[PDB]
């Protein structure tokens, strides 16, 4: 309960909760880097233009 | 009784140490993020000098 060196639950959260979010954040960070292109913003305009 | 009054001081003295270390370990974890920010910047400048 207090939290020993190798507590099954607490220790598991240290590697799971932390790393999982890290990868998730990386996806958004790396995903935003790939979406910074100005040609992708022109495609959005195309979509609206093509539908009209 | 003499010892009782003298041994009680340690309890409160040791309790203060734990209270101070609790906030110091959180700052140590926060330093990591800041350290990586300047470490990536230092390497970024080195990569800019390789061109």
């Amino acid at each position: 309960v207090r939290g020993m060196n190798t507590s099954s639950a607490m220790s598991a959260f240290e590697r799971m909760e932390e790393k999982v979010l890290m990868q998730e954040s990386r996806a958004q960070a790396l995903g935003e880097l790939a979406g910074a292109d100005l040609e992708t913003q022109f495609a959005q305009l195309e979509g609206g233009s093509d539908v009209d | 009784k003499a010892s009782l009054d003298t041994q009680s001081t340690q309890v409160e003295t040791l309790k203060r140490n734990l209270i101070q270390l609790e906030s110091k370990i959180s700052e140590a974890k926060t330093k990591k993020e800041m350290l990586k920010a300047r470490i990536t910047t230092a390497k970024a400048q080195e990569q800019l000098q390789g061109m």
Binding site: M22, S25, R26, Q28, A29, L30, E32, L33 | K36, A37, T40, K43, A44, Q47, G50, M51
Partner: peptide, 27 residues
């Protein structure tokens, strides 16, 4: 050519690390 090809391939691979570092900074 020999001194340009090697530099062109090494200067482009260094940008990938820079982008990865920015992702970590963004994270």
């Amino acid at each position: 050519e020999k001194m340009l090809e090697q530099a062109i391939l090494e200067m482009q691979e260094d940008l990938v690390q820079l982008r990865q570092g920015v992702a970590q900074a963004i994270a």
